[PDB]
């Protein structure tokens, strides 16, 4: 059971900066069986480095792999826009191959707190049997953000889905939508619907809320 | 060089089984294992299994044991992946991969299982869903508040299948501040997304905001005016 971990979760760099991605093995492993892959958005993954440090053919000199034992690193120097994507380490020794969770490399910018909005269910949806409550986090940075739903101060779990836009090409920000799915019956039994947002750009978590029936 | 060609996109019912094909173009056939790697939406790469064709050296990921089968058709020079008892956890893009190595390999007849993958197939999309074609229902996301003169409104495009749906605002005349989020598959096997836009709150009573929702596989076009509820 060889498990690879990676750090950081997201690496933010400006054009021309240098970044170092880390891969950590569960136990000692030989450098002969470690690889790094690059995946740009929408494209197929591509081999960058094999045997920990051997650069694949056609791969530019900006990428260099190093490491031994349990610590392996990939260094990107003179970062260029084509280098934006997800980088994953792989162990291909033994019988069962495994990949690291991947590290995202995105464009660096200053911190921006999200603008938070909450939308009640429309009446046209309530006459259909379901109720959707939507929470919008607009134009924030960094990517990391937490959203917690609360119905009459009761924390919700398992009944929400969220999706995130790609990093915007103009302002380098993200936007996030979280959707709470409720039945009409359960929606009509409660009043206060609150979306609580935690982000680096906020001194403290922000809560947007509405009362069912404009109360 | 060496190239890999895969079969087309698949939509499978939960509990059924899927079969994907990978046909190498170039190089040899029995020297290098074909390794299958998949990617669920918004997740990392996951190794499924690998098999050296004909020679029959293979291993399956522990997560896929008693459920997966890798095999080949030697005459047609084609390898296959079979995954049974599909659940929504199996939805994603499936890649067949291998190591280019010695190409035609005139100096080697050995077989090799342990290698990185510098050759990748284009990927086969597998959607696990118990749903048929169905048009979306478009609901408004009404704005109301006393955010620095900027309000948000949008449209919730819910309960459709399959992908894709296209969304625009005011017949494409409104583009600034528009965020159309990636669709998400909900537990019912139907897609759902929202499209939001930030507008000056002072013009809510004057400007008309309509979202244009077009779902080609269902031949459905909807235009929903988003008004502040009062
Ligand atoms: C895991 O490996 C480390 C490092 O070992 C060195 O690097 C390897 C790539 C290989 O070349 C080894 O032969 C090297 O010794 C081990 O740390 C070493 O432990 C030995 C004890 O046997 C000690 O004498 C060395 O000084 C240590 N090296 C350093 C740099 O401190 C470590 O013990 C291995 N893990 C286990 C559980 O044995």
C-alpha to C-alpha distance for A106 and B218, rounded to whole angstroms: 37
Ligand 1 centroid distance, CA of A28 (Å) = 9
Render A147-159 in DSSP notation, one character per residue.
EEEEETTEEP-SS
Q: Are residues A51 and A31 in the same domain?
A: yes
DSSP helix/strand/coil, A33 = helix
* Residues contacting A160, CB < 8 A, separation 6+: A147, A149, A178, A179, A180, A181
Residue ending a domain, choose from A89, A107, A125: A107
CA dihedral sign of residues B163, B169, B170, B175: negative
Same domain, A125 and A68: no
Contact B121 A44 (CB under 8 A): yes
Which residues does chain A have within 8 Å of residue B183's beta carbon, measured at their own beta carbons? Answer: 163
Percent of chain A as helix, strand, coil, to the nearest 5: 5, 55, 40
Q: Are residues A100 and A124 in the same domain?
A: no
Distance from Cα A69 to the centre of ligand 1, integer Å: 8
Q: Where in chain B is the domain with CATH 2.60.40.10?
A: 3-128, 137-225
Shared-domain flag, residues A71 and A101: yes
Kindly give the number of the ligand 1 atom that is closest to the alpha carbon of A28: 1
According to DSSP, residue B7 is labeled -
Domain extent for A207: 115-211
- What stretch of H or E contains B61? none
Contacts of A51 (CB under 8 A, 6+ apart): A31, A32, A33, A34, A35, B116
How many domains does chain A divide into? 2
> Are A8 and A103 members of one domain?
yes
Q: Chain B neighbours among A 45-64 (CB < 8 Å)? A: 45-47, 50-51, 56-57
Which of A107, A132, A149 is a domain's end point?
A: A107
Alpha carbons A202 and A159: distance in angstroms, whole number: 26
Distance CA B154, CA B230 (A): 17
Q: For the CA atoms of chain A, what is the radius of gyration?
A: 22
Identify the CA nearest to A29 among candidates A46, A62, A48, A5.
A5
Distance (Å, rounded) from C-alpha A89 to C-alpha B40? 17
- Asked whether residue A129 falls in the same domain as residue A100, the answer is no
Domain closes at, from A107, A134, A151: A107
Solved using: X-ray
Q: Extract the tokens encoding A150.
A: 């609360």
Q: Is A14 on the interface with B (CB under 8 A)?
A: no
Resolution in A: 2.1
Report the distance separating Cα A119 and Cα B192, nearest Å. 16
Please give the C-alpha separations between residue A145 and each of A116, A128, A177, B198, in angstroms, as whole numbers: 12, 32, 11, 20
Instruction: Specify the residue for token string 């260029």.
Output: A80
User: Is A35 close to B45, i.e. CB distance below 8 A?
Assistant: no
Helix (H, G, I), strand (E, B) or coil at B62: helix
**Residues of B with Cβ-Cβ distance to A121 under 8 angstroms:** 139
- Whether A133 and A121 have beta carbons less than 8 Å apart is answered as yes
Is the separation of the CB atoms in A65 and A36 below 8 Å? yes
Q: Contact A91/A25 with Cβ under 8 angstroms? A: yes
Question: Do A148 and A60 belong together in one domain?
Answer: no
For chain A, positions 168-187, list CB contacts with chain B under 8 A: 175, 177, 179, 181
Domain CATH for A154: 2.60.40.10
**For B3-128, CATH number?**
2.60.40.10
Closest residue by Cα to residue B9 from B215, B18, A121: B18
Say how far apart CA B224 and CA B226 lie, in whole Å. 6
A·B CB contacts under 8 A: 119
Indicate which residue's Cα is closest to atom 2 of ligand 1. Answer: A69
- Interatomic CA distance for residues A157 and A177, integer angstroms: 16
Query: What six digits make up the tokens of A172?
Result: 């380098």
Quick one: tokens of A89? 């380490």
| SS3 state of residue A187 | helix
Q: Does domain B137-225 have CATH number 2.60.40.10?
A: yes
Q: Are residues A77 and A125 in the same domain?
A: no
Chain-centroid distance, C-alpha A176: 11
**Chain-centroid distance, C-alpha A183:** 29
Residues from chain A contacting residue B178 (CB–CB below 8 Å): none
Chain breaks in chain B (C to N over 2.5 A) after: 146
Alpha-carbon distance values, B206 to A7, A104, B200, B202, B225 (Å): 50, 43, 11, 8, 13
- Regarding whether A120 and A42 lie in a shared domain, the answer is no
């Amino acid at each position: 059971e060889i498990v690879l971990t990676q750090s950081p979760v997201t690496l933010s760099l400006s054009s021309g900066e240098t970044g170092t991605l880390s891969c950590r093995a569960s136990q000692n492993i030989s450098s002969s069986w470690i690889a790094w892959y690059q995946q740009r958005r929408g494209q197929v993954p591509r081999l960058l480095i094999s045997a920990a440090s051997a650069r694949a053919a056609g791969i530019p000199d900006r990428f260099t792999g190093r490491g031994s034992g349990t610590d392996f690193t990939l260094t990107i120097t003179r970062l260029e826009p084509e280098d934006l994507g997800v980088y994953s380490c792989q162990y291909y020794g033994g019988s069962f191959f495994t990949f690291g969770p991947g590290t995202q490399v995105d464009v660096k910018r200053t911190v921006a707190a999200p603008s938070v909005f909450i939308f009640p269910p429309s009446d046209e949806q309530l006459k259909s049997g379901t109720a959707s409550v939507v929470c919008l986090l607009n134009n924030f940075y960094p990517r990391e953000a937490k959203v917690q739903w609360k119905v009459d101060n009761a924390l919700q779990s398992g009944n929400s889905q969220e999706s995130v836009t790609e990093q915007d090409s103009k302002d380098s920000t993200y936007s996030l939508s979280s959707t709470l799915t409720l039945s009409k019956a359960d929606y009509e039994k409660h009043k206060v619907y609150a979306c609580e947002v935690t982000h680096q750009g906020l001194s403290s978590p922000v809560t947007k809320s509405f009362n069912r029936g404009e109360c | 060089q060496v190239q890999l060609v895969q079969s087309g996109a698949e939509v499978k019912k939960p509990g059924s089984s899927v079969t994907i094909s990978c046909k190498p173009v170039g190089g040899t056939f029995t020297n290098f294992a074909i390794h299958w790697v998949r990617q669920a939406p918004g997740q990392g790469l996951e190794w499924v299994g690998g098999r050296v064709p004909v020679v029959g050296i293979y291993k399956y990921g522990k997560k896929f044991h008693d459920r997966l089968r890798l095999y080949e058709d030697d005459p047609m020079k084609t390898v296959f992946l079979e995954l049974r008892s599909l659940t929504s956890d199996d939805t994603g893009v499936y890649y067949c991969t291998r190591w280019r190595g010695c190409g035609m390999c005139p100096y080697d007849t050995s077989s090799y299982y342990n290698d990185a993958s510098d050759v990748w197939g284009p990927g086969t999309k597998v959607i696990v869903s118990a749903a048929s074609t169905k048009g979306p229902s478009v609901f408004p996301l009404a704005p109301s508040s006393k955010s620095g003169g900027t309000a948000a409104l949008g449209c919730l495009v819910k309960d459709y299948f399959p992908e894709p749906v296209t969304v625009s605002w005011n017949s494409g005349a409104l583009t600034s501040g528009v965020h159309t989020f990636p669709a998400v598959l909900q537990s019912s096997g139907l897609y759902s997304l929202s499209s939001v836009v930030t507008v000056p709150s002072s013009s809510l009573g004057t400007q008309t905001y309509i979202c244009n929702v077009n779902h080609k596989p269902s031949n459905t076009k909807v235009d929903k005016k988003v008004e502040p509820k009062s």
